[PDB]
Amino acid sequence: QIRNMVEPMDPRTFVSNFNNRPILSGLDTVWLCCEVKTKDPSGPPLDAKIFQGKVYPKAKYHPEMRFLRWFHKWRQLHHDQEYKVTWYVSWSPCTRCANSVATFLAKDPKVTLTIFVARLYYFWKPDYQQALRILAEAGATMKIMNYNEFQDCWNKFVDGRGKPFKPWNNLPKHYTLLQATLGELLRH
Amino acid sequence: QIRNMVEPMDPRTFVSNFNNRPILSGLDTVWLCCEVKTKDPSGPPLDAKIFQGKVYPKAKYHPEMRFLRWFHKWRQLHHDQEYKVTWYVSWSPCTRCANSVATFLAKDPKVTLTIFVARLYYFWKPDYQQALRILAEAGATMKIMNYNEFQDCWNKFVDGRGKPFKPWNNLPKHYTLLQATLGELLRH
Ligand SMILES: [Zn+2]
Ligand SMILES: [Zn+2]
């Protein structure tokens, strides 16, 4: 049970940065909730951690970059086998980071990433639209966080204090918008 | 010109009821701006009108239903030829209105409708989704109002007032959302 493997983030912090209002400003931070497993989806969570970084460049200090460096040294300490990573990230990847995660997934065919985004990041600038396409073109499975993944993220990475998940009104309103957007953007 | 054929609506009313923030309810009414034309769209508009209806049932007082009765009476006064109707309605259609318009478009292969919605109405509830999916059958061309269609509507149906149309913030961002949602819902 990964609640001990990580240093769970604050409830007032989660409700703020994982709010899925598609157009939102005032959140300068992107929170990545990481989780490593084997080619199995049914066994134990093998390792887990929470990265965070601020959005202004350099992109070398972004929570998807902190992951890529961490997972490089971590892959060394464990045996060569197929891994299944999955992210619960607050904002979608930026443009430079999407290129890094693509070069990574390309070199290393044993890992297969799955990113759940709470919000799509600059879904209107066409640079960021091809960033999402770059990822799904490298093998990364891109999805929108729905009620289950918001809940499953609360249980696993928060000071839940046994408290159960409290969903805001307009969650599936925003979900239907964001899924359909990600659906159109990835379409080719 | 058609600013003369109708009873132009108020400027403060148009920005109010045609604002395209995908999520809205503080809005009790639905506004339908109609326009009938010939086979050739490069000709002038034959007639035009503004309907109104409150959003609560029965659907008999919905602005797309007042049209269906009005257009039946108007059809008689002219010779039979092919009409190209186009709506600029603020909310998308409800479920029962969509049945009317589908069966209506079915009786008369000479009419071809084009509906421009400013917002999708209850785009998350699953029946209101096959609601748009009906009109898509029986031929209705479904589209989202982008800036051009908002502008063209101000010109034709709004008491211009000698002040220019000022488009509201995030209009083409909201367009991306609603355009993506509608697109996915119609293939679904
Ligand atoms: Zn980045
Ligand atoms: Zn109706």
Residue numbers in the entry:
A (entry chain C), B (entry chain A): 4 to 138, 143 to 195
Q: Which sentences did the original study use to describe this structure?
A:
APOBEC3s (A3s) are deoxycytidine deaminases that have important roles in mammalian innate immune responses.
However, these two structures are essentially the same, with a Cα r.m.s. deviation of about 0.54 Å, indicating that the structures from the two different crystal forms, including the surface loops, are not affected by different crystal packing or buffer conditions. Since purified rA3G-CD1 exists primarily as a dimer in solution, we attempted to identify the dimerization interface. Interestingly, only one interface is shared between the two different crystal forms, which has the largest contact surface area of ∼726 Å2 (compared to other non-shared interfaces ranging from 664 to 88 Å2), suggesting that this shared interface is the dimer interface. Several residues centred around L184 on α6 from each subunit pack with each other, while W127 on loop-7 of one CD1 subunit packs with the aliphatic side-chain of K180 on α6 of another CD1 subunit. The loop-7 residue F126 is buried within the interfaces, forming the hydrophobic stacking interactions between loop-7 and α6.
